[PDB]
């Protein structure tokens, strides 16, 4: 892991990499990059 950004064309593309990092399915594609929101 040294990719610091995940590029995306929509939110569906963010779930997998955000889950890998955080353990949770909670993400949003904004400005063609993923936001990983993490876990409650």
From Swiss-Prot:
The keyword Signal applies. Expressed by the venom gland. GO terms for cellular component: extracellular region. The record marks 37 as: Aromatic residue of the functional dyad. The keyword Transport does not apply. It comes from the Eukaryota. GO terms for molecular function: ion channel inhibitor activity; potassium channel regulator activity; toxin activity. The record marks 28 as: Basic residue of the functional dyad. It is found in: Secreted. Disulfide bonds join 8-29, 14-34, 18-36, 24-39. Coiled coil: none annotated. Keywords: Disulfide bond, Ion channel impairing toxin, Neurotoxin, Potassium channel impairing toxin, Secreted, Signal, Toxin, Voltage-gated potassium channel impairing toxin. Inhibits Kv1.2/KCNA2 and Kv1.3/KCNA3 voltage-gated potassium channels. Has the structural arrangement of an alpha-helix connected to antiparallel beta-sheets by disulfide bonds (CS-alpha/beta). Belongs to the short scorpion toxin superfamily. Potassium channel inhibitor family. Alpha-KTx 06 subfamily. This is Potassium channel toxin alpha-KTx 6.9. It comes from Opistophthalmus carinatus. The chain holds residues 24 to 61 of 61 of the full protein.
